[PDB]
Amino acid sequence: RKMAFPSGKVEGCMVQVTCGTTTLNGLWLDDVVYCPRHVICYEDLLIRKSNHNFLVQAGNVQLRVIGHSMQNCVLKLKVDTANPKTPKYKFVRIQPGQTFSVLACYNGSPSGVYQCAMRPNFTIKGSFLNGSCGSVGFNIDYDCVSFCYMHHMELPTGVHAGTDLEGNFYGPFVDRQTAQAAGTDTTITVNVLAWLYAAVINGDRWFLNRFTTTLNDFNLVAMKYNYEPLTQDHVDILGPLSAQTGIAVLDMCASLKELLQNGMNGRTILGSALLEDEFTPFDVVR
Amino acid sequence: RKMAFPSGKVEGCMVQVTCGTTTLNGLWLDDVVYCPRHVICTSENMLNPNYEDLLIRKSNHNFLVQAGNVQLRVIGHSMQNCVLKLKVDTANPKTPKYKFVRIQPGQTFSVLACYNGSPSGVYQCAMRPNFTIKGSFLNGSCGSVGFNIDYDCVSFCYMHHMELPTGVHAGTDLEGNFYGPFVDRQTAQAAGTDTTITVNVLAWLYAAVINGDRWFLNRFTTTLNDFNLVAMKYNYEPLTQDHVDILGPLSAQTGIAVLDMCASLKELLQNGMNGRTILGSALLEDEFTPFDVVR
Asked: Do the chains contact at A6 and B1, CB–CB below 8 Å?
């Protein structure tokens, strides 16, 4: 099973932000609420705004905006009181292929939690309800919350686009009503390899063969099947799993090369009949 | 996406229960800690434990309960079926609004997997028709609980007790009664043949229609009897008139009669997916309920 992180620490940070007739989710940390700047639908639009234009609700309580400011594509609303439920936290930016949990929220109220990967085309295959704008993604490492994502937009193909918590978009997207579409996506090779290592650790070994391939030879098969190219960085990352199982990375790649041409052939790997790519090497170790 | 419930209300209830050399998770609600009774078992007891004999020999101070950095004082103990119930000094300040419920096969719920009392991950689940859980249980997840959350009220429906030889998981409701024919004993017990939850696949196909996908529909219908004769050859659960009644609302919203959706499923089982996907899945998904789909 994919598992999401326990969401309790983030749940106590979610609030509702309303400007005019538009309402979405915000993240309340210390005395600042963070939310997508498109709540004010940007240089002009925010000069004309004053504090009384923003209504922040932390459950029953209304919060008083005493200052506002923009950072890239996120609005930073300073409020009268600090969130007593603020966890230890940091803002971080992730890379395609890395995984995180999303707390989907409806008008400030947490609705559900799921585990994601940042796709190579920088979008998120998520299930986002009406009014989930401003929901955040995060990892938890030893009671420290690493916030890595804030949801902004649904793209026509169903997937989702957002920013880091400093307002920098992931991917070539803008927060305007322009026609935009996800680029062609790609399977995350290093995560498939990690998931095959987890299958071996779990006793699934039928796909193991006696052969080894080269980095160059694999990457040609990889692009023929729309797979991210494998780097020496990926190989080194999978090192602990190769040590743990005795299967070298380029021998697992031969295994993967055969899977991409024969299929599981009525067999399964860990119960699936497709190759899972939303588990990172780190995820498998933990 | 399959989503789990936000886990915060349950995280504040998780504690660690230690008895002798055995440690697992407990659930701290008001002034009672619930946990699996095999916490009182040693190695030499697993095969044929006599729980009433083992429990009579314990006193309150044999039970070390820890809520984070704080030891809770046990002031009484009692056994109800296969759950131990430890009365403590202190009512949990973070006790949510809650109830205990017993669920049926096909029902879904979230599991907060914990290790030694600390929550580690959350996932969404279905009770399989053979009364097991296809869980993801780290080495010390005994006593982790499953739940639903409706309008801020938590329904506790499952407590984890053991992994079966086939990799799946068995456990009880919060009254200590096992789901299925399993026992908290290290015997040669095995899960029955697992079947697909038919009513959940059909509800999900209705969810595919509501989301615009219709490629799998066909012009046929079927009788209920004929549908079940076919589906059982694929290890699908028989569909009852109650299931039909339950899908009525989704049949209403989509204009597709239940037995017409059944004919579509019969053909999907005959043909496979032909490399296509239905919602975002290339598999027939059976862990979303009719109730879930309306949400």
From this structure: no
- Residue A163 phi/psi, 5-degree rounding, is -125, 170
Q: What is the CA radius of gyration of chain A?
A: 21
Method: X-ray
Nearest CA to A63 out of A17, A11, A131 is that of A17
In whole angstroms, what is the distance from residue B274 CA to residue B295 CA? 29
Spell out which residues of chain B touch residue A124, defining contact as CB-CB under 8 Å.
none
> Where in the sequence is the domain holding A247, given as residue range(s)?
189-285
List, in sequence order, the alpha helices (H) in chain A.
Answer: 8-11, 43-47, 189-201, 215-224, 232-237, 239-245, 249-262, 281-285
CATH of the domain at B213: 1.10.1840.10
Q: With an 8 Å Cβ cutoff, are A112 and B3 in contact? A: yes
Distance between CA atoms of residues B171 and B180, nearest Å:
9
Q: How many CA atoms lie within 13 A of A3 on its CB side?
A: 21
The residue in chain A having the minimum alpha-carbon distance to the alpha carbon of residue B119 is A6
| Among B172, B180, B173, B193, residue whose Cα is nearest residue B131 | B180
B142 catalytic residue (yes or no) = yes
| Resolution attained, angstroms | 2.1
**Within its chain, how far is the Cα of B295 from the centroid?**
19
